[PDB]
């Protein structure tokens, strides 16, 4: 059973990264099993624009650490982000903005939830898959 925790938006880097205050202290989020094409790769500039107005237009953001690592290598934290109760991780998901990727061991507690979403853009061949 994992628990969702508060946090403020302090800046939206890209589709998947985003800069936020969480017990008060700045910190940058790595979005957990999802992978978002850079900025200049296709399809890298509607996963931005899609997270930016997403978390930008949201009353309350939330986070959820998994089971496993919460940090990475980078020192970035590891966490499903909630815009409004709405998993971003997925929504990118089902718009077919990002792909499932980097499911590792003992941090993949919503992986099916995604490999679901991501059936459903694939079939509707949803940006990424067209
Ligand atoms: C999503 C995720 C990424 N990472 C690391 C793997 C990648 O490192 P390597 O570059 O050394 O492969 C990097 C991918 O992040 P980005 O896609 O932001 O670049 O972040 C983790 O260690 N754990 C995770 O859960
Ligand atoms: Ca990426």
């Known amino acids: 059973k994992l628990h969702k925790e508060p946090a403020t938006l302090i800046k939206a880097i890209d589709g998947d990264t985003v800069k936020l205050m969480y ?5 940058t989020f790595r979005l957990l099993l999802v ?17 930016k107005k997403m978390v930008e237009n ?4 939330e986070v ?7 940090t990475d290598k980078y020192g970035r934290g590891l966490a499903y ?3 409004d109760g709405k ?7 089902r718009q077919g903005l990002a792909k499932v990727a ?18 459903q853009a694939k079939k509707e061949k949803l940006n990424i898959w067209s």
């Open 81 to 83: 982000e909630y815009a």
């Open 35 to 51: 992978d978002t094409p850079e900025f200049n790769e296709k399809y890298g500039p509607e996963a931005s624009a899609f997270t």
């Open 23 to 27: 017990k008060g202290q700045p910190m």
């Open 102 to 119: 980097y499911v590792y061991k003992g941090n993949n507690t919503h992986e099916q939830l995604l490999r679901k979403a991501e059936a």
């Open 58 to 61: 949201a009353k309350k953001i």
């Open 87 to 93: 998993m971003v991780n997925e929504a990118l998901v």
């Open 64 to 70: 959820e650490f998994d089971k496993g690592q919460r």
